[PDB]
Amino acid sequence: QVQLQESGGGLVQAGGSLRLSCAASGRAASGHGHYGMGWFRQVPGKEREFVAAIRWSGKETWYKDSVKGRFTISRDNAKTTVYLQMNSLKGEDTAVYYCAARPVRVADISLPVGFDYWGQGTQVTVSS
Numbered sequence: 001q002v003q004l005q006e007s008g009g010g011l012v013q014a015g016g017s018l019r020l021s022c023a024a025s026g027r028a029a030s031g032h033g034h035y036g037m038g039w040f041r042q043v044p045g046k047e048r049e050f051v052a053a054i055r056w057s058g059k060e061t062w063y064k065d066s067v068k069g070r071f072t073i074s075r076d077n078a079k080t081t082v083y084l085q086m087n088s089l090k091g092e093d094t095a096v097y098y099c100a101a102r103p104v105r106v107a108d109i110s111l112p113v114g115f116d117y118w119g120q121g122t123q124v125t126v127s128s
């Protein structure tokens with residue numbers, strides 16, 4: 001199974017920058033050996049939402065409208081690592097972020113589906 005471990009979340013202020021990293025190890029259960037990645041956030045009193053996603057190759061990414069501009073999702077050169085660069089935090093952003101691996105290819109990556117493995121969660125609080 002794909003072991004996902006995140007870190008980098010914590011205390012900041014509105015207009016700052018913060019960077020979350022998601023390490024990945026182990027083989028997967030489905031597919032031919034690959035997997036796409038994505039980030040989700042849990043906000044108190046609201047349902048879980050899909051915030052960013054990247055195809056296994058990096059040919060295309062997807063962002064939720066309210067983060068486009070400000071957030072970017074990438075993967076470094078040797079890879080198991082996924083990053084989420086958060087710039088110009090607004091306070092609404094305030095929540096617990098999660099990274100998840102998708103073992104089987106999907107036609108539309110804006111879709112919340114196929115995420116078999118989940119990381120543990122990092123609280124991000126934006127004070128004013």
Ligand SMILES: [Cu+2]
Nearest residue numbers: 032033034035
């Ligand atoms: Cu390969």
Ligand SMILES: [Cu+2]
Nearest residue numbers: 032034056105
């Ligand atoms: Cu593939």
